[PDB]
Amino acid sequence: KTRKESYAIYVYKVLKQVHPDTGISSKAMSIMNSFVNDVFERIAGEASRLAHYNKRSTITSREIQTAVRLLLPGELAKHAVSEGTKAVTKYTSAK
DNA sequence: GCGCGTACGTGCGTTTAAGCGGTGCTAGAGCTGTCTACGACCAATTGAGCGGCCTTCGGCACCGGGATTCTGATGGGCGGCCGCGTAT
């Protein structure tokens, strides 16, 4: 049949996590995927840009790390890094 | 439109610090050179994800049955009708 994949499974549990027996319209659901896919290119594209400025050829986590910092304002940014840094840190701990 | 008020432009003198070209020093960019770890690629197996399809309980707002309260015809008894009516 057709494809047209989306992030619907990811957005839904997140909302469950923050009000479990709280609801949503089928119109705000796409707004959400539209919103995510939009932020996706915003961050990953910028990573691509720096990589081939100061003369290197792969994109790691550090770059995102840097990228994120100047893409967003002071207070959210730090918490965001923190969360980000740990999630992965744990990831490696396992293996 | 008009009129009041005052603040901001234009000037001079005083004053303060940029810009100039002079030297010295070393830090940090840029180059360079070897290793090897981590990502792309190709393979084969496996279940997360998408289309397709129809689920069940709880909550908003309309509802249900039974005792109880208020309105209506009924009725004997004390009074009043003054006006037609029979008896001597």
Place of tokens 């770059």: A63
How many angstroms separate the CA of A18 from the C1' of B60? 26
In Å, how far are A17, A37, A40, A53, A83 from A12, measured between CA atoms?
Answer: 9, 16, 18, 38, 20
Nucleotide nearest to A4 (CA to C1'): B50
| CA A63 to the chain's CA centroid | 14
List the helix and strand counts (H, then E) for chain A: 4, 0
Chain B bases under 7 Å from protein CB?
Answer: 39, 49-52
